[PDB]
Amino acid sequence: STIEEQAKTFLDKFNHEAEDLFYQSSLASWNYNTNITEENVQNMNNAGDKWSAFLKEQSTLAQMYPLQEIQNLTVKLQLQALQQNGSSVLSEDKSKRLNTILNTMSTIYSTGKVCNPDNPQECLLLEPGLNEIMANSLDYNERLWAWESWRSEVGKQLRPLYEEYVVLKNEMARANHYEDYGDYWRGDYEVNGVDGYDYSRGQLIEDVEHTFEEIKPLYEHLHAYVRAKLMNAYPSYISPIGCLPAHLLGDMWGRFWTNLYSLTVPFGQKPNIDVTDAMVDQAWDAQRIFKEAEKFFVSVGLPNMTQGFWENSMLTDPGNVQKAVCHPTAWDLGKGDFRILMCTKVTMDDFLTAHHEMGHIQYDMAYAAQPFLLRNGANEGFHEAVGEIMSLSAATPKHLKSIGLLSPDFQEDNETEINFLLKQALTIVGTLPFTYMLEKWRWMVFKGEIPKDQWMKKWWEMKREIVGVVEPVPHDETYCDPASLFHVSNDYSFIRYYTRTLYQFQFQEALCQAAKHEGPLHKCDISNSTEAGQKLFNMLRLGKSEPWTLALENVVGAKNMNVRPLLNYFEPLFTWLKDQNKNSFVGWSTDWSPYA
Amino acid sequence: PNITNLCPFGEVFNATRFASVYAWNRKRISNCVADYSVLYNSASFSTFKCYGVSPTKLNDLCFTNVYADSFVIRGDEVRQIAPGQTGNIADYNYKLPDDFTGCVIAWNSNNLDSKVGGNYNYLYRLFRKSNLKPFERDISTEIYQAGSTPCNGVKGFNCYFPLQSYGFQPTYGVGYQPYRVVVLSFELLHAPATVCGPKKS
Ligand SMILES: *[C@@H]1O[C@H](CO)[C@@H](O)[C@H](O)[C@H]1NC(C)=O
Ligand SMILES: *[C@@H]1O[C@H](CO)[C@@H](O)[C@H](O)[C@H]1NC(C)=O
Ligand SMILES: *[C@@H]1O[C@H](CO)[C@@H](O)[C@H](O)[C@H]1NC(C)=O
Ligand SMILES: *[C@@H]1O[C@H](CO)[C@@H](O)[C@H](O)[C@H]1NC(C)=O
Ligand SMILES: *[C@@H]1O[C@H](CO)[C@@H](O)[C@H](O)[C@H]1NC(C)=O
Ligand SMILES: *[C@@H]1O[C@H](CO)[C@@H](O)[C@H](O)[C@H]1NC(C)=O
Ligand SMILES: *[C@@H]1O[C@H](CO)[C@@H](O)[C@H](O)[C@H]1NC(C)=O
């Protein structure tokens, strides 16, 4: 009869057939990932083509129902999600060119192999080897060689490709009624039609700048401390007044600073909280790791894993004969089928990763009651944030003592808390200026604020201004230094990590206040608290049905992303860094004082 | 006395194939001895919810006719086979009256009714203009008209096909795995009641 009832019936038929097709595609992808064989690749490609063609046909059929004649918010949300053209609005030649460019960038990044000139008989790929070289070497010129050679090869290959990519994506986005591709990415956080809880695409940049302005003193003190320690490690290269050299940050791009924990440890004399040896002594299998994670999730009141999870997941490397992707991934295949694909080792990192991925599985299970097109996080930040809160809670010494993995007579003094907080800052605080600078640069590239001849001159200027990292030698416009990273070269949004990092600590403060924890925030464990699990599950059950602002109101009681829980989390470390930086100079100079 | 001529409960519960929820099979059971304690004491049934009568006194009472309706539904759809409920199965596939006397028996059949490729032999009616009356069967395959435009027999815009398959695969969740449901309907009419329980000697 009415347009709204017509859309509801269309959504019902869509949901029903979509769930089945998405299941077939997801099962084909799972069979490819656990069994890398050419027929599995063919089956995955066939299922993906059927899924994409089906989404194209339903997008073509969904647009015939006008949005303004529908009053139910959930129906309007599903219709808004389905009615996106995507690349379909663009011409067939340009769509084919864009797909070809994306595929060739994926092949160039995945199969990029670089080794030293005059010794070309064998070469190393980034993921098997260059990562290990960047994370473990202590040699200045070796890291400089690896960094410059990989940015030379990858950037000189990817620069014309990225120049075509920005133009095609901007054309598609303006054809889709967006200002640029950056506005298309910022449209994930856009809430329209809800009274009071509306969020605009333009508010995201202002909120990110407003939060980063409060991030900046803590990052400045951490940067000064890391600069002093790197000056101790490398005597003459680092200046007291200047920025950090780019190739010394412990990773290939500067994404994380977690590989500098050995060089920058506050109290080396004190022991670490490594529990690897304790699990080795007690013969903890990966099955035991996941069962302990399940015990953690039932302690807080969340549902336990299904029988199909234990039957169908691959939690151990299969063997030599059968090949599988080693990356840990939680799979929501559809129809109540939840699996984890992780090559689990007996390490603390794998144990925390097991908690993180089972948190992903719990988030997926919670919104299974929702319609198919609303089965996602409220934004891209929440889905990762709910796994990261489990990673936060599991890493605490109280959780390790409770499950028996840590000795009951382990002394928790202030020094171990300081060095643990510094490790968490190197992982968590260090990625925030890099993430903000990368997204702001990509937004300015899409917006047209930066001309193509001035991309790199601005970029390093941004990196000195924001990240406090200086280039070793100047780069001209023949280089494409951003696109050496996985997310930017493969068309992925990058603001999810910044939002995830802030949402992580906001959720942590909310659950710890719910659990009546009486100490420091980093000493808080959310186990044994039914009310904390209930407060989490109230947001978890919604999925994408409600605005992310309303979900954040459900957890923390605020309508916007907030920066104060992160600063509260690192407050002991903040005071310690302020004490340790009395002689040294906090802040950096944008001049070429260390090296250029 | 000596009791023979048991009711054919083997051809309902232990059937090699079950019907879909839309074209649900109805078997009229008359003029035999119905032993309900064999069904109640089995551990193979997940749901044995009896409405309007208790299972303990079923083995004593006598009824004129017994209607055994058999079909296959999802795990999450077993709750809709009850008086007063709502959902696609109750509104469009199989409707129970509010004044229902009988038992709803359901058990998991993932072993038999699921194949790795997907078993599309079981269907459910997804749409219809009005809700079903109690104990009504709709096996029509006419194209549903959701819009003003006439369908004219072609599944185009706003015109969809009523019956949709459940692609039952063994790796599904417990709420999506196939469940075989047998509903026993007990009525008493003025005719001589002949479906009686077994009598002790
Ligand atoms: C992996 O693929 C091979 C291909 O020959 C097949 O024989 C094997 O059964 C598969 N293993 C699993 C666990 O599916
Ligand atoms: C919107 O539709 C859903 C079913 O799709 C229904 O449950 C919900 O109550 C509706 N909301 C309003 C406000 O009508
Ligand atoms: C998708 O593209 C078609 C083709 O021009 C257009 O008519 C339609 O309005 C577009 N949909 C949206 C949501 O912009
Ligand atoms: C999950 O918990 C319930 C109740 O505690 C239990 O019956 C069920 O067996 C558990 N699941 C598994 C896979 O053991
Ligand atoms: C730890 O506590 C002791 C005693 O309160 C104090 O002397 C020491 O300076 C503290 N260290 C740090 C890093 O806070
Ligand atoms: C949570 O509850 C279990 C069950 O009593 C208990 O063994 C465990 O120690 C509790 N956790 C903490 C941190 O006390
Ligand atoms: C059906 O099969 C089971 C399995 O062997 C058997 O125990 C039972 O007696 C059979 N008949 C009925 C009516 O359940």
CSV table of C-alpha atoms in Angstrom, one decimal, chain A residues 70-432:
chain,number,residue,atom,x,y,z
A,70,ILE,CA,9.5,6.9,5.4
A,71,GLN,CA,9.2,7.8,9.1
A,72,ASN,CA,10.5,4.7,10.9
A,73,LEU,CA,14.1,5.3,11.8
A,74,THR,CA,15.4,1.7,11.5
A,75,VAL,CA,13.8,1.3,8.0
A,76,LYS,CA,15.3,4.6,6.9
A,77,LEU,CA,18.7,3.6,8.2
A,78,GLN,CA,18.6,0.3,6.3
A,79,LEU,CA,17.4,2.1,3.2
A,80,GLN,CA,20.1,4.7,3.5
A,81,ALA,CA,22.7,2.0,3.8
A,82,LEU,CA,21.4,0.1,0.8
A,83,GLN,CA,20.8,3.1,-1.5
A,84,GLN,CA,24.5,4.1,-1.7
A,85,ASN,CA,25.7,4.0,-5.3
A,86,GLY,CA,29.3,3.3,-4.4
A,87,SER,CA,31.3,3.2,-7.5
A,88,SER,CA,28.2,2.4,-9.6
A,89,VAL,CA,27.4,6.1,-10.2
A,90,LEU,CA,30.8,6.5,-12.0
A,91,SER,CA,31.2,5.6,-15.7
A,92,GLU,CA,32.1,2.1,-16.7
A,93,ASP,CA,35.5,3.1,-18.1
A,94,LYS,CA,36.4,5.1,-14.9
A,95,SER,CA,35.0,2.3,-12.7
A,96,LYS,CA,37.2,-0.3,-14.4
A,97,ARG,CA,40.2,2.1,-14.2
A,98,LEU,CA,39.6,2.5,-10.4
A,99,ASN,CA,39.3,-1.2,-9.8
A,100,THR,CA,42.4,-1.9,-11.9
A,101,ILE,CA,44.3,0.8,-9.9
A,102,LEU,CA,43.2,-0.7,-6.6
A,103,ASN,CA,44.1,-4.2,-7.6
A,104,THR,CA,47.6,-3.1,-8.9
A,105,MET,CA,48.2,-1.2,-5.7
A,106,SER,CA,47.3,-4.3,-3.7
A,107,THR,CA,49.7,-6.4,-5.8
A,108,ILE,CA,52.5,-3.8,-5.5
A,109,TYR,CA,52.2,-3.5,-1.7
A,110,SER,CA,51.7,-7.3,-1.1
A,111,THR,CA,54.5,-8.5,-3.5
A,112,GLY,CA,57.0,-5.6,-3.0
A,113,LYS,CA,60.5,-7.0,-2.5
A,114,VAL,CA,63.5,-4.7,-1.9
A,115,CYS,CA,67.1,-5.6,-1.1
A,116,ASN,CA,70.5,-3.9,-1.1
A,117,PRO,CA,72.1,-2.7,-4.4
A,118,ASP,CA,75.1,-4.8,-5.6
A,119,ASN,CA,73.8,-7.8,-3.7
A,120,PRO,CA,70.6,-8.8,-5.6
A,121,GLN,CA,70.8,-12.6,-5.5
A,122,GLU,CA,68.1,-12.8,-2.8
A,123,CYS,CA,65.7,-10.2,-1.5
A,124,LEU,CA,63.5,-9.7,1.5
A,125,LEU,CA,59.8,-8.9,1.6
A,126,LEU,CA,58.4,-6.4,4.0
A,127,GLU,CA,56.1,-8.7,6.1
A,128,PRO,CA,58.5,-11.7,6.5
A,129,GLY,CA,61.7,-9.6,6.9
A,130,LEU,CA,61.7,-5.8,6.8
A,131,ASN,CA,59.3,-5.6,9.7
A,132,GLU,CA,61.8,-7.7,11.8
A,133,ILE,CA,64.7,-5.5,10.6
A,134,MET,CA,62.9,-2.3,11.6
A,135,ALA,CA,61.8,-3.7,14.9
A,136,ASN,CA,65.1,-5.3,16.0
A,137,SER,CA,68.1,-3.5,14.5
A,138,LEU,CA,70.2,-1.0,16.4
A,139,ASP,CA,72.2,0.2,13.4
A,140,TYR,CA,71.6,3.7,12.1
A,141,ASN,CA,72.7,3.3,8.4
A,142,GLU,CA,71.0,-0.1,8.1
A,143,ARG,CA,67.6,1.2,9.1
A,144,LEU,CA,68.3,4.3,7.0
A,145,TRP,CA,69.0,2.1,4.0
A,146,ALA,CA,65.9,-0.1,4.5
A,147,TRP,CA,63.6,3.0,5.0
A,148,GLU,CA,64.9,5.0,2.1
A,149,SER,CA,65.0,2.0,-0.3
A,150,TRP,CA,61.5,0.9,0.5
A,151,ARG,CA,60.1,4.4,0.2
A,152,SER,CA,62.1,4.8,-3.0
A,153,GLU,CA,60.7,1.7,-4.7
A,154,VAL,CA,57.2,1.8,-3.3
A,155,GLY,CA,56.7,5.6,-3.7
A,156,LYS,CA,58.2,5.8,-7.2
A,157,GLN,CA,55.9,3.0,-8.3
A,158,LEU,CA,52.8,4.3,-6.5
A,159,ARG,CA,52.9,8.1,-7.1
A,160,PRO,CA,51.2,8.3,-10.5
A,161,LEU,CA,48.8,5.6,-9.3
A,162,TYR,CA,47.8,7.6,-6.3
A,163,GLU,CA,47.5,10.8,-8.4
A,164,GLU,CA,44.9,8.9,-10.6
A,165,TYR,CA,43.3,7.4,-7.4
A,166,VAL,CA,42.6,10.8,-5.8
A,167,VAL,CA,41.0,12.2,-8.9
A,168,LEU,CA,38.8,9.1,-9.5
A,169,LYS,CA,37.7,8.9,-5.9
A,170,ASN,CA,36.9,12.6,-5.8
A,171,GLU,CA,34.9,12.2,-9.0
A,172,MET,CA,32.9,9.3,-7.5
A,173,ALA,CA,32.3,11.2,-4.2
A,174,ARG,CA,31.1,14.4,-5.8
A,175,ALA,CA,28.9,12.2,-8.0
A,176,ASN,CA,27.5,10.8,-4.8
A,177,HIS,CA,26.7,14.2,-3.3
A,178,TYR,CA,29.7,14.5,-1.1
A,179,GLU,CA,32.3,17.3,-1.1
A,180,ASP,CA,35.2,15.0,-1.5
A,181,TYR,CA,36.3,11.4,-0.7
A,182,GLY,CA,37.3,12.7,2.7
A,183,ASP,CA,33.6,13.7,3.3
A,184,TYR,CA,32.6,10.2,2.1
A,185,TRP,CA,34.8,8.7,4.8
A,186,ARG,CA,33.6,11.2,7.4
A,187,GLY,CA,30.0,10.2,6.5
A,188,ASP,CA,30.3,7.1,8.7
A,189,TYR,CA,29.9,9.3,11.8
A,190,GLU,CA,27.0,11.3,10.3
A,191,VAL,CA,23.8,11.1,12.3
A,192,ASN,CA,20.7,12.8,10.7
A,193,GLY,CA,17.1,12.9,11.8
A,194,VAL,CA,17.5,12.2,15.5
A,195,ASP,CA,16.6,15.1,17.8
A,196,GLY,CA,19.6,16.2,19.9
A,197,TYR,CA,21.8,13.3,18.8
A,198,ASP,CA,22.6,14.7,15.4
A,199,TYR,CA,26.2,14.6,14.3
A,200,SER,CA,27.6,16.3,11.2
A,201,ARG,CA,30.4,15.3,8.9
A,202,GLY,CA,32.1,18.7,9.5
A,203,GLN,CA,32.0,18.3,13.3
A,204,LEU,CA,34.4,15.3,13.1
A,205,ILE,CA,37.4,17.4,12.0
A,206,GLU,CA,36.7,19.9,14.8
A,207,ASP,CA,36.3,17.2,17.4
A,208,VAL,CA,39.5,15.5,16.3
A,209,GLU,CA,41.4,18.8,16.6
A,210,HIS,CA,39.8,19.6,19.9
A,211,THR,CA,40.8,16.2,21.4
A,212,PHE,CA,44.3,16.3,19.9
A,213,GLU,CA,44.9,19.7,21.4
A,214,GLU,CA,44.5,18.0,24.8
A,215,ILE,CA,46.5,15.0,23.7
A,216,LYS,CA,49.5,17.2,22.8
A,217,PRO,CA,51.1,17.9,26.3
A,218,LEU,CA,51.3,14.2,27.1
A,219,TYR,CA,52.7,13.4,23.7
A,220,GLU,CA,55.2,16.2,24.0
A,221,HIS,CA,56.5,14.8,27.3
A,222,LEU,CA,56.6,11.3,25.9
A,223,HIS,CA,58.4,12.6,22.8
A,224,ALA,CA,61.0,14.4,24.9
A,225,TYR,CA,61.6,11.2,26.9
A,226,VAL,CA,61.9,9.0,23.8
A,227,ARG,CA,64.2,11.7,22.3
A,228,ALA,CA,66.5,11.6,25.3
A,229,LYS,CA,66.6,7.8,25.3
A,230,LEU,CA,67.3,7.6,21.6
A,231,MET,CA,70.0,10.2,22.1
A,232,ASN,CA,71.5,7.7,24.6
A,233,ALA,CA,71.2,4.9,22.1
A,234,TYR,CA,72.5,6.9,19.1
A,235,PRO,CA,75.0,9.6,20.4
A,236,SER,CA,75.4,12.1,17.6
A,237,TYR,CA,72.4,11.8,15.3
A,238,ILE,CA,69.6,13.1,17.6
A,239,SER,CA,69.6,16.9,18.5
A,240,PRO,CA,68.3,18.0,21.9
A,241,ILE,CA,66.2,20.7,20.3
A,242,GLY,CA,64.9,19.0,17.1
A,243,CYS,CA,62.6,16.3,15.9
A,244,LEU,CA,63.2,12.6,15.9
A,245,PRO,CA,64.8,10.9,12.8
A,246,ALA,CA,62.1,9.0,10.9
A,247,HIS,CA,63.8,5.6,10.6
A,248,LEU,CA,64.5,5.2,14.4
A,249,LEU,CA,60.9,4.8,15.7
A,250,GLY,CA,60.9,1.0,15.8
A,251,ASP,CA,58.4,0.4,13.0
A,252,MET,CA,58.5,0.9,9.2
A,253,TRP,CA,56.3,4.0,9.2
A,254,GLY,CA,56.1,5.3,12.7
A,255,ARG,CA,52.7,3.7,13.4
A,256,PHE,CA,53.6,2.3,16.7
A,257,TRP,CA,56.5,3.0,19.1
A,258,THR,CA,56.2,-0.4,20.9
A,259,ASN,CA,59.5,-1.6,19.6
A,260,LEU,CA,61.4,1.0,21.6
A,261,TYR,CA,60.4,-0.5,24.9
A,262,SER,CA,63.8,-2.1,25.3
A,263,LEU,CA,65.7,1.1,24.6
A,264,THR,CA,63.4,3.4,26.6
A,265,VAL,CA,62.6,1.2,29.7
A,266,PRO,CA,62.5,3.3,32.9
A,267,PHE,CA,63.5,0.5,35.3
A,268,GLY,CA,65.4,-2.2,33.6
A,269,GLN,CA,66.6,-3.6,37.0
A,270,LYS,CA,63.0,-4.4,38.0
A,271,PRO,CA,61.4,-7.6,36.5
A,272,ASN,CA,58.8,-7.6,33.8
A,273,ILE,CA,55.3,-9.0,33.9
A,274,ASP,CA,55.9,-11.6,31.2
A,275,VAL,CA,53.7,-14.6,31.8
A,276,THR,CA,54.9,-16.7,28.9
A,277,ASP,CA,57.2,-18.9,31.0
A,278,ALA,CA,54.4,-19.5,33.5
A,279,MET,CA,52.1,-20.9,30.7
A,280,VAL,CA,54.9,-23.0,29.3
A,281,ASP,CA,55.5,-24.5,32.8
A,282,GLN,CA,51.8,-25.3,33.2
A,283,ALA,CA,51.5,-26.5,29.6
A,284,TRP,CA,48.8,-24.1,28.5
A,285,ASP,CA,47.4,-25.1,25.1
A,286,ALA,CA,45.7,-22.6,22.8
A,287,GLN,CA,42.4,-24.4,23.7
A,288,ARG,CA,43.1,-23.5,27.4
A,289,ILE,CA,43.8,-19.9,26.3
A,290,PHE,CA,40.4,-19.6,24.6
A,291,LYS,CA,38.6,-21.4,27.5
A,292,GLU,CA,40.2,-18.9,30.0
A,293,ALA,CA,39.0,-16.0,27.7
A,294,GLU,CA,35.5,-17.6,27.7
A,295,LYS,CA,35.7,-17.8,31.5
A,296,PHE,CA,36.5,-14.1,31.6
A,297,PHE,CA,33.5,-13.3,29.4
A,298,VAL,CA,31.1,-15.5,31.5
A,299,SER,CA,32.5,-13.8,34.6
A,300,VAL,CA,31.3,-10.4,33.4
A,301,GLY,CA,27.9,-11.8,32.4
A,302,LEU,CA,28.2,-12.1,28.6
A,303,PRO,CA,27.0,-15.2,26.8
A,304,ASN,CA,29.5,-18.1,26.3
A,305,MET,CA,30.7,-19.4,23.0
A,306,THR,CA,28.5,-21.7,20.9
A,307,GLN,CA,29.3,-25.3,20.2
A,308,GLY,CA,29.8,-24.4,16.6
A,309,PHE,CA,32.6,-22.0,17.6
A,310,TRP,CA,34.6,-24.8,19.3
A,311,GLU,CA,33.9,-27.2,16.4
A,312,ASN,CA,34.5,-24.9,13.5
A,313,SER,CA,37.3,-22.5,14.6
A,314,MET,CA,41.0,-22.9,13.7
A,315,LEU,CA,42.9,-22.0,16.9
A,316,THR,CA,46.1,-23.7,16.0
A,317,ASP,CA,48.3,-23.7,12.9
A,318,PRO,CA,47.2,-26.7,10.8
A,319,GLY,CA,50.6,-28.1,9.7
A,320,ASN,CA,53.1,-28.1,6.9
A,321,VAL,CA,50.8,-29.7,4.3
A,322,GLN,CA,47.9,-27.2,4.7
A,323,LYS,CA,48.6,-23.5,4.3
A,324,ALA,CA,46.7,-20.8,6.2
A,325,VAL,CA,46.8,-17.0,6.7
A,326,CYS,CA,48.5,-16.4,10.1
A,327,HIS,CA,46.7,-13.1,10.8
A,328,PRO,CA,44.2,-13.3,13.7
A,329,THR,CA,40.7,-12.6,12.5
A,330,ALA,CA,37.3,-13.0,14.0
A,331,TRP,CA,34.6,-14.1,11.5
A,332,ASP,CA,30.9,-13.5,11.8
A,333,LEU,CA,29.9,-15.8,8.9
A,334,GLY,CA,26.2,-15.2,9.4
A,335,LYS,CA,23.3,-17.4,10.6
A,336,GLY,CA,24.7,-17.6,14.1
A,337,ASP,CA,28.1,-19.0,12.9
A,338,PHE,CA,31.0,-17.3,14.8
A,339,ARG,CA,34.6,-18.4,14.3
A,340,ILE,CA,38.1,-17.3,15.2
A,341,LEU,CA,41.0,-17.8,12.8
A,342,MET,CA,44.2,-17.4,14.8
A,343,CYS,CA,47.6,-19.2,14.7
A,344,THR,CA,47.8,-19.1,18.5
A,345,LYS,CA,51.2,-19.4,20.1
A,346,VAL,CA,51.9,-19.7,23.9
A,347,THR,CA,52.7,-16.0,24.4
A,348,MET,CA,51.2,-13.1,26.3
A,349,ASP,CA,50.5,-11.3,23.0
A,350,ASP,CA,48.6,-14.2,21.6
A,351,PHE,CA,46.6,-14.6,24.9
A,352,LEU,CA,45.7,-10.9,24.8
A,353,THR,CA,44.9,-11.3,21.1
A,354,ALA,CA,42.6,-14.2,22.0
A,355,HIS,CA,40.8,-11.9,24.5
A,356,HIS,CA,40.6,-9.2,21.8
A,357,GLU,CA,39.2,-11.4,19.1
A,358,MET,CA,36.7,-13.1,21.5
A,359,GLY,CA,35.6,-9.6,22.3
A,360,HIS,CA,35.0,-9.1,18.6
A,361,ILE,CA,33.0,-12.3,18.6
A,362,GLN,CA,30.9,-11.2,21.6
A,363,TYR,CA,30.2,-7.9,19.8
A,364,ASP,CA,29.1,-9.8,16.7
A,365,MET,CA,26.9,-12.2,18.7
A,366,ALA,CA,25.2,-9.4,20.5
A,367,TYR,CA,23.6,-7.8,17.4
A,368,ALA,CA,22.6,-11.1,15.8
A,369,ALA,CA,19.0,-10.2,16.6
A,370,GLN,CA,19.3,-7.1,14.4
A,371,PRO,CA,18.4,-7.1,10.7
A,372,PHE,CA,21.2,-8.0,8.4
A,373,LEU,CA,22.0,-4.6,7.0
A,374,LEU,CA,22.2,-3.2,10.6
A,375,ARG,CA,24.6,-5.9,11.8
A,376,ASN,CA,27.6,-3.7,12.3
A,377,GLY,CA,29.1,-1.4,14.9
A,378,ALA,CA,27.4,2.0,15.4
A,379,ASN,CA,30.5,3.5,13.9
A,380,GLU,CA,33.9,2.0,12.8
A,381,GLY,CA,35.4,2.9,16.1
A,382,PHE,CA,33.2,0.8,18.4
A,383,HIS,CA,33.9,-2.6,16.8
A,384,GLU,CA,37.6,-2.3,17.5
A,385,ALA,CA,37.1,-0.5,20.8
A,386,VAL,CA,35.1,-3.4,22.4
A,387,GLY,CA,38.0,-5.8,21.7
A,388,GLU,CA,40.6,-3.3,22.9
A,389,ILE,CA,38.8,-3.0,26.3
A,390,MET,CA,39.1,-6.7,26.8
A,391,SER,CA,42.8,-6.4,25.9
A,392,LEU,CA,43.1,-3.7,28.5
A,393,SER,CA,41.3,-5.7,31.2
A,394,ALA,CA,43.1,-9.0,30.6
A,395,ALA,CA,46.6,-7.4,30.8
A,396,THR,CA,46.1,-6.2,34.4
A,397,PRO,CA,48.1,-8.0,37.1
A,398,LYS,CA,44.9,-8.6,39.1
A,399,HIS,CA,43.6,-10.7,36.2
A,400,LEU,CA,46.8,-12.6,35.9
A,401,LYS,CA,46.9,-13.3,39.6
A,402,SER,CA,43.3,-14.3,39.6
A,403,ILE,CA,43.7,-17.0,36.9
A,404,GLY,CA,46.9,-18.3,38.4
A,405,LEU,CA,49.2,-17.2,35.6
A,406,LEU,CA,51.1,-14.7,37.9
A,407,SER,CA,52.7,-15.5,41.2
A,408,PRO,CA,50.5,-14.5,44.2
A,409,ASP,CA,53.6,-13.0,45.9
A,410,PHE,CA,54.4,-10.7,43.0
A,411,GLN,CA,55.1,-7.2,44.3
A,412,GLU,CA,53.1,-4.5,42.5
A,413,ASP,CA,55.1,-1.3,43.3
A,414,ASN,CA,55.0,2.0,41.5
A,415,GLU,CA,58.0,1.3,39.2
A,416,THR,CA,56.4,-1.7,37.5
A,417,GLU,CA,53.2,0.4,37.0
A,418,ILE,CA,55.3,3.2,35.5
A,419,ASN,CA,57.1,1.0,33.0
A,420,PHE,CA,53.9,-0.9,32.1
A,421,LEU,CA,52.2,2.5,31.5
A,422,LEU,CA,55.1,3.6,29.4
A,423,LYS,CA,54.8,0.4,27.2
A,424,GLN,CA,51.0,1.1,26.9
A,425,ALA,CA,51.8,4.7,25.9
A,426,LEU,CA,54.3,3.6,23.3
A,427,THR,CA,51.7,1.4,21.8
A,428,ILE,CA,48.6,3.6,22.3
A,429,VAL,CA,49.7,7.3,22.8
A,430,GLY,CA,52.3,7.2,20.1
A,431,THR,CA,49.9,6.2,17.3
A,432,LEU,CA,47.6,9.2,17.9
